[PDB]
Amino acid sequence: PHRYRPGTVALREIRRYQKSTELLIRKLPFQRLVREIAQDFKTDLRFQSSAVMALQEASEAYLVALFEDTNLCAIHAKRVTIMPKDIQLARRIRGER
């Protein structure tokens, strides 16, 4: 019977993910979400497959950068745990509101 202490695998994963460049969201799920949002704007649309890839690259880079900012807001508050209020602080300072 064996166990890593909480935080050990987490750090392992940080090093792993910061090392690679592959998209971290599953392709089909992400694609359904795009098609749904678009359909709500306009019916009977097609997407070139690189259009979807573009969005996905853009969305993952947006979300990763937002998490670094969020992480900095948590750390500022003397925590190591990101919370919805950290994200909200980031987005307000970023002028997304």
């Binding site: 050990t8 750090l11 940080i14 910061q18 690679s20 890839m53 573009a54 853009a58 992480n71 190591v80």
Partner: protein, 106 residues
């Protein structure tokens, strides 16, 4: 029978750059030096990035520059990082970077 590129000592294409300037409606008229000067700046910047990207490829024991190397190049260089501060390189990933307080012990 000489191109304006060889005349200016440039790899980048002065004719092309002249053409693109005209159709972009940046002004009524385009001076003869403008595409020359612009093609050189473009050449300069692309040499700068390829140098640095080449090194990142080499540091990874790779012979082929891929988007991760371009990202290492740009983000590790203060000035290219700023010039491209609002740009995203598809398939570039991020810089390894873990905030101190996150590490184990004291």
């Amino acid at each position: 029978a000489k191109t304006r590129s060889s005349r200016a000592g440039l790899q980048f294409p002065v004719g092309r750059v002249h053409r693109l300037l005209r159709k972009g409606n940046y002004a009524e008229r385009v001076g003869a030096g403008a595409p020359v000067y612009l093609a050189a700046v473009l050449e300069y910047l692309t040499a700068e990035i390829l140098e640095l990207a080449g090194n990142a490829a080499r540091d990874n024991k790779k012979t082929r520059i891929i988007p991760r190397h371009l990202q290492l190049a740009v983000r590790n260089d203060e000035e290219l990082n700023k010039l491209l501060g609002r740009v995203t390189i598809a398939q570039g990933g991020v810089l390894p970077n873990i905030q101190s307080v996150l590490l184990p012990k004291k």
